[PDB]
Amino acid sequence: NPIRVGVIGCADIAWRRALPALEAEPLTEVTAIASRRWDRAKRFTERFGGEPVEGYPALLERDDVDAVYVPLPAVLHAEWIDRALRAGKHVLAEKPLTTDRPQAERLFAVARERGLLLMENFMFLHHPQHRQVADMLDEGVIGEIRSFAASFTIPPKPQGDIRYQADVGGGALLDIGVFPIRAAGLFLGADLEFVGAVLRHERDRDVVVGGNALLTTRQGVTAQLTFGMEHAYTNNYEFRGSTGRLWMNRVFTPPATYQPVVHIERQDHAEQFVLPAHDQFAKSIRAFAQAVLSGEHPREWSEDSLRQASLVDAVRTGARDIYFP
Numbered sequence: 001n002p003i004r005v006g007v008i009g010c011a012d013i014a015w016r017r018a019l020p021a022l023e024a025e026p027l028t029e030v031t032a033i034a035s036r037r038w039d040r041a042k043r044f045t046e047r048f049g050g051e052p053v054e055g056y057p058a059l060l061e062r063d064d065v066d067a068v069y070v071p072l073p074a075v076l077h078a079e080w081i082d083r084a085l086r087a088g089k090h091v092l093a094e095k096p097l098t099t100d101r102p103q104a105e106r107l108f109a110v111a112r113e114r115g116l117l118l119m120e121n122f123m124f125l126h127h128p129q130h131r132q133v134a135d136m137l138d139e140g141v142i143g144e145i146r147s148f149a150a151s152f153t154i155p156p157k158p159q160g161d162i163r164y165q166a167d168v169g170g171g172a173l174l175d176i177g178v179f180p181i182r183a184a185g186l187f188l189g190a191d192l193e194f195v196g197a198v199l200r201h202e203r204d205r206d207v208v209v210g211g212n213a214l215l216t217t218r219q220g221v222t223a224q225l226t227f228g229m230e231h232a233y234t235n236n237y238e239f240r241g242s243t244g245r246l247w248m249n250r251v252f253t254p255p256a257t258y259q260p261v262v263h264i265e266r267q268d269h270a271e272q273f274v275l276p277a278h279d280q281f282a283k284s285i286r287a288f289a290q291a292v293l294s295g296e297h298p299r300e301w302s303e304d305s306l307r308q309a310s311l312v313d314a315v316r317t318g319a320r321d322i323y324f325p
């Protein structure tokens, strides 16, 4: 019997990625979709099925909901994950899970006490391309790794976007910079430590719109991370090694049908490998539903989410903040 999923917040990411995955996944059934406006709920259910619900508390009270997907603005994640967990629902929370490490520990504790899964939906972790890259690096294709760079920058969102409100969307670090920071954790491991960063704050709206961070492992393998929403589109990572370098585009949000290309360069020789296409949004939703159904809640997911939250806090706290103009 599929797990019955309810959605709180009719989010663009829900309409674009999450809900088509839920609807097509045999293991999950969309039973209710809640919105602050019934009309918006209803438009979502007409598209993806389930009962449309006005307001979020009503959905949490439902007996036919087993798990709740929370694609709310970052700043609002915590209140509603806490309430969904106390309603007895497992939770798939969008990235970033929350805004800081102590808040994240408290949410995992509420979950832990009730045996419930809380999962941060970094769907890109579920795309096989990253492990195919890590396997090439482990095979020595570029020698020992010296440093890492990752970038996710996008052109400015329309006025009114959730990201232009510090206390709803919380801006380019919480909502975009979390990606390169997460890829640095995936590839360089659990001992990354903050070294320096810059955050550009737009005075007009009072929100972070771009930044760059420098992290290091204790062996001095550095990560240089760029993020922002005042920029042309970039979405890439690159490794510099002792005998070569490796890079790739569309690393955080490859289409379901899009075939990645790994680029390698070494002295007098370069290569590109075409990898198979995969649907990372389907795979992450599948992973969630299998954990819920089996009761096997991987310990690494919550430990990585906690470390991720610490590094984000370390960047925010450590950065030089520059306001413009």
Ligand SMILES: NC(=O)c1ccc[n+]([C@@H]2O[C@H](COP(=O)([O-])OP(=O)(O)OC[C@H]3O[C@@H](n4cnc5c(N)ncnc54)[C@H](OP(=O)(O)O)[C@@H]3O)[C@@H](O)[C@H]2O)c1
Pocket: 008, 009, 010, 011, 012, 013, 014, 034, 035, 036, 037, 040, 041, 071, 072, 073, 074, 076, 094, 095, 096, 162, 168, 174, 175
């Ligand atoms: N499309 C994306 O930008 C995108 C991509 C990947 C990940 N994410 C992550 O997914 C989450 C949502 O992002 P999104 O981009 O899909 O945002 P979005 O389209 O603004 O969706 C946020 C949803 O939250 C609800 N909400 C509740 N209080 C709100 C408020 N005060 N202001 C605005 N919305 C409010 C709204 O649902 P109702 O009006 O129906 O209540 C809104 O549709 C974030 O954690 C983000 O970091 C977003």
Ligand SMILES: Cc1cn([C@H]2C[C@H](O)[C@@H](COP(=O)(O)OP(=O)(O)Oc3ccccc3)O2)c(=O)[nH]c1=O
Pocket: 017, 154, 155, 175, 176, 233, 235, 253
């Ligand atoms: C391909 C592409 C996208 N965008 C814009 C369009 C969009 O505003 C932004 C990101 O598009 P995407 O990488 O598809 O990621 P999701 O929207 O799935 O999730 C996020 C949404 C917002 C922040 C981060 C991730 O880039 C471009 O400007 N050019 C491009 O070639």
Ligand SMILES: [Cl-]
Pocket: 121, 122, 123, 124, 125, 252
């Ligand atoms: Cl993702």
Ligand SMILES: [Cl-]
Pocket: 249, 261
């Ligand atoms: Cl390319």
Ligand code: NA
Pocket: 316, 317, 318, 319, 320, 321
């Ligand atoms: Na600071």
